[PDB]
Design a protein around this ligand. Structure first.
Ligand SMILES: [Zn+2]
Ligand SMILES: [Zn+2]
Ligand SMILES: [Zn+2]
Lengths: 131, 184, 222, 167, 55, 171
């Protein structure tokens, strides 16, 4: 539910203390109380049923956008744009090559968003950030 | 009648059908059908006894589902008695229901938090619990077993954490059952 | 487009009025979403090209996309003389809040600026344009000559008058806060009744706002 | 002075900087004035206690690798400290094994390097104690560093301290 | 018939303490009578309201 | 955690120590039950710093005991543990309940519920240890442990350790 935390099962109505805490590894509607419950002792697996991804308490954050897919796309764009930051001044005014660079960075962002080529793109971005 | 009155009638019906027995259901449904009842009214409609309605009236007064009016009148035979009138105060009753369910879920959450604490220990001879903090001050010279302060017995582990998932599942099974109440 | 719409939804959720320039909005959008101004300037053209190439038979589901593309192009291309207002309450009479995002044009000369550039001679004319010098200050253009004629009449064909008070010398006004005053409404009703009694053919009655009409006509019928 | 019970207080947590009412930043010394709370890192503690022990040895007289240092501090403890030295001997072997810096020059210049941070004495003492290698590792080990130091400054401080540690 | 309607939550009835004998049948205008488990019933009884004026 | 603090202690001198050099018996008697003494209010007191001048003021004779009561004020180095702090140490004992790690002068017990599940007890090893897929926890092994709960009595302090957090465990 967009209003209710499935892990602790508490409504917004009679308990307005819950918060929209999400995890970049796996985006789950989990309140701050459940986060301070489970992951304060240590890293654990995702309390959502059907998911078992490891996750950390300090990596938790609140979701800015209502849509989960848009939020993860923006987070992936943040994780790419920090190292992928060539500008038109980096290209010495070459507009066509800058547009090709924009196409390439949007394509690798899309690939990381859908996970179709996650291994090769991840290796490429590691090799790019090592410079 | 008023749809909001229908909603509060269904809410009181659901709470008395869920958290109360059949006689309580009959009493509250009698009040929800016939708005104000006296003792003889309920006794005639339900064929119930004065001591039989005793715990029912006591519980719905303590839980504020039924209010009482101490009006005495003057019948033409002049054999007047100070009769009591049973009726419902809807906002007070729904506030009492709200407070009761909120304290139930908060107490269950606090019990879940106490179950999130590690297992600890309990000495079976003395039947006294021992937390993990006080176990270390009571360990042996061999650094192997925790011994009791009085019984001097090796401590055995409690179950604070093993039933934590059980308490969470109890909370989940409470939550979907109370869902019509929160919807109301 | 999806993340731009989600950013607009994020900006929509607020408890007070924000008066921000397009530049500040673009900086906030860039630092929170990594959307730049130049891709936003091509949003309408790219959306139209995509809709053409998709060859969609139905277009009823993409009208809000037209609204979003219009907003994006307008707030990206224009930064000076424009203002973005996000009001938590569209109408104050509503119980539930209904937030609204208004992108208004503060400078009226922007739209008419290419008209005066394209055409050398423009004849601005109205029967009731006054004062004449207000508009060259409002709209950045120069007038070679401006003048207002007064009709020459054998007899005074029209008789204006200013009515400042009712029959009982109670002052009459149409301020929206005092529209429920029974004295002012009674004076207006008596005036309208007498004018309807003394006018031969017809009457036209003008009100400052439609809600003022609704209130005063409802209590007139009352 | 008031006689309130004042029994309600938050638990002593190093993450939330709560170390107790007897461990505030300002401490009243025996000469009267408020003075900054003294938190020693492990190398700093070893140097201070060794200086105290050699001072006591000099007072009694008037009245480097880890192997050769352990025997020296052991015979210093035997010739300086009397009974109930088991806790002190455990502390000295602990500070010998967990010694980031050996001589006084390294420790003092580490103090003046950490004084440029302007952070809490407890967290810079932990930084001088814990041998963290990456900034996020120090952040998750010491929760006080969250929203307290810049990541690049923390990274350069940690890699500097890695260069500063000897043997 | 009364018992199979009662377990179907179609009617309301009161039975004697010594034996499950139906005596007076009512109409069940509400829902299921066994929607709440016994543990949630008994922990409901463990809480209380402080006073009429506080809440 | 190690600290330097100014402390005051009430010391009773027996009348036999009312000699011409009472101050040195008083300083020694300050030494043997403060050096290494454990107090729950101020932690394990390690060493009394600045011995040459120690605030020994005029001492009060107890009215029925006859012993002199001196409130000696002194500066000493202490070691007070806290919850939520990370301390390194060496394991000194191991068991199926867990293992005890020696930190400074104090031993902290890490319970069986506070290791990651890959670590399990192996009593067949000599000495008994905790074995995992990547590391072992044996006696005389350096290990980094965070203290998450500590209890202090009037003269004894005990703490609970855990290594389940990342960037903890063996060093
Ligand atoms: Zn939750
Ligand atoms: Zn997950
Ligand atoms: Zn016992």
């Amino acid at each position: 539910n967009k209003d209710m935390c499935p892990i602790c099962k508490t409504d917004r109505y009679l308990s307005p203390d819950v918060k929209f805490l999400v995890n970049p590894e796996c985006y789950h509607r989990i309140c701050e109380s459940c986060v301070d419950r489970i992951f304060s002792l240590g890293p654990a697996q995702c309390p959502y049923k059907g998911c078992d991804k490891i996750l950390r308490k300090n990596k938790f954050k609140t979701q800015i956008f209502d849509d989960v897919e848009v939020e993860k796309e923006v987070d992936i764009r943040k994780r790419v744009f920090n190292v992928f930051n060539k500008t038109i001044d980096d290209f010495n005014g070459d507009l066509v090559e800058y547009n090709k660079y924009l196409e390439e960075v949007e394509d690798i962002i899309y690939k990381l968003d859908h996970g179709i080529d996650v291994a090769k793109t991840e290796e490429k971005l590691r090799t790019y950030e090592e410079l | 009648d008023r749809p909001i009155d229908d909603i509060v009638k269904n809410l009181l019906k659901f709470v008395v059908r869920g958290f109360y027995g059949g006689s309580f259901v009959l009493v509250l449904d009698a009040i929800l059908f016939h708005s104000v009842l006296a003792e003889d009214d309920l006794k005639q409609l339900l064929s119930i006894n004065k001591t039989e309605l005793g715990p029912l009236i006591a519980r719905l007064r303590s839980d504020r589902l039924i209010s009482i009016h101490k009006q005495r009148e003057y019948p033409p035979n002049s054999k007047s008695v100070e009769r009591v009138y049973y009726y419902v105060k809807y906002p007070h009753a729904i506030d009492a229901i709200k407070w009761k369910v909120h304290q139930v879920v908060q107490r269950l959450k606090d019990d879940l938090d106490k179950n999130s604490e590690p297992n600890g220990y309990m000495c079976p001879i003395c039947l006294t619990k021992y937390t993990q903090l006080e176990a270390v001050q009571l360990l042996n010279f061999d650094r192997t077993e925790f011994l009791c302060s009085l019984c001097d017995e090796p401590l055995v582990e409690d179950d604070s954490g093993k039933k934590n998932k059980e308490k969470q599942d109890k909370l989940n099974r409470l939550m979907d059952q109370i869902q019509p109440i929160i919807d109301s | 487009l999806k993340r731009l719409i989600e950013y607009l939804k994020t900006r929509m959720k607020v408890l007070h009025v924000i008066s921000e320039t397009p530049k500040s909005f673009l900086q906030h959008l860039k630092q929170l979403t990594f959307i730049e101004r130049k891709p936003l300037r091509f949003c309408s053209e790219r959306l139209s090209l995509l809709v053409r190439t998709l060859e969609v038979t139905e277009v009823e589901d993409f009208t809000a996309l037209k609204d979003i593309a219009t907003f994006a192009t307008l707030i990206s291309t224009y930064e000076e003389g424009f203002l973005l207002i996000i009001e938590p309450y569209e109408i104050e009479n509503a119980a539930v809040p209904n937030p609204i995002m208004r992108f208004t044009c503060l400078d009226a000369s922007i739209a008419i600026k290419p008209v005066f550039e394209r055409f050398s001679s423009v004849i601005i004319t109205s029967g009731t344009i006054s004062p004449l010098d207000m508009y060259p200050r409002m709209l950045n253009f120069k007038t070679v000559l401006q003048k207002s004629y007064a009709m020459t009449l054998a007899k005074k064909s029209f008789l204006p008058m200013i009515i400042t008070k009712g029959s009982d010398q109670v002052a009459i006004s149409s301020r929206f806060e005092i529209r429920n005053d029974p004295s002012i409404v009674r004076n207006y009703g008596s005036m309208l009744v007498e004018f309807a009694k003394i006018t031969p053919d017809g009457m036209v009655v003008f009100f400052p706002s439609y809600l003022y009409m609704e209130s005063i006509v409802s209590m007139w019928q009352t | 002075r008031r006689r309130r019970l004042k029994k309600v207080e938050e638990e002593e947590n190093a993450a939330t900087l709560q170390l107790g009412q007897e461990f505030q930043l300002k401490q009243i010394n025996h000469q009267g004035e408020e003075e900054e709370l003294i938190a020693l890192n492990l190398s700093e503690a070893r140097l201070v206690i060794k200086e105290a022990l050699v001072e006591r040895r000099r007072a009694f007289k008037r009245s480097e690798t880890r192997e050769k240092e352990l025997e020296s501090i052991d015979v210093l403890l035997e010739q300086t400290t009397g009974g109930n030295n088991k806790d002190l001997k455990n502390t000295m072997q602990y500070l010998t094994n967990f010694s980031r810096f050996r001589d006084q020059e390294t420790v003092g210049a580490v103090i003046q390097l950490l004084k440029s941070t302007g952070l809490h004495p407890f967290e810079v003492a932990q930084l001088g104690s814990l041998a963290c290698d990456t900034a996020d590792e120090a952040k998750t080990l010491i929760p006080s560093l969250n929203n307290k130091i810049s990541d690049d400054e923390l990274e350069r401080i940690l890699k500097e301290l890695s260069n500063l540690e000897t043997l | 018939t009364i018992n199979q309607l009662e377990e179907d939550s179609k009617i309301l009835v009161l039975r004697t303490k010594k034996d499950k004998t139906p005596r007076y049948v009512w109409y069940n205008s509400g829902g299921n009578l066994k929607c709440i488990d016994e543990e949630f019933v008994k922990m409901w009884e463990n809480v209380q309201l402080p006073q009429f004026a506080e809440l | 955690m190690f600290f330097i603090k100014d402390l005051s202690l009430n010391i009773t001198l027996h009348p036999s120590f009312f000699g011409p050099r009472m101050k040195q018996y008083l300083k020694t008697k300050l030494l043997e039950e403060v050096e290494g003494s454990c107090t729950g209010k101020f932690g394990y007191i390690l060493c009394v710093l600045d011995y040459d001048n120690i605030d020994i003021q005029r001492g009060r004779i107890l009215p029925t005991d006859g012993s002199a009561e001196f409130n000696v004020k002194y500066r000493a180095v202490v070691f007070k543990p806290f919850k939520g702090e990370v301390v390194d140490g060496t394991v000194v004992s191991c068991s199926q309940h867990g293992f005890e790690v020696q930190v400074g002068p104090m031993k902290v017990f890490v319970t069986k519920h506070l290791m990651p599940q890959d670590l399990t007890f192996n009593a067949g090893s000599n000495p008994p240890s905790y074995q995992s897929s990547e590391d072992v926890i044996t006696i005389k092994s350096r290990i980094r442990v965070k203290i998450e709960g500590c209890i202090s009595q009037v003269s004894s302090i005990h703490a609970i350790g855990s290594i389940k957090e990342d960037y903890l465990g063996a060093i």
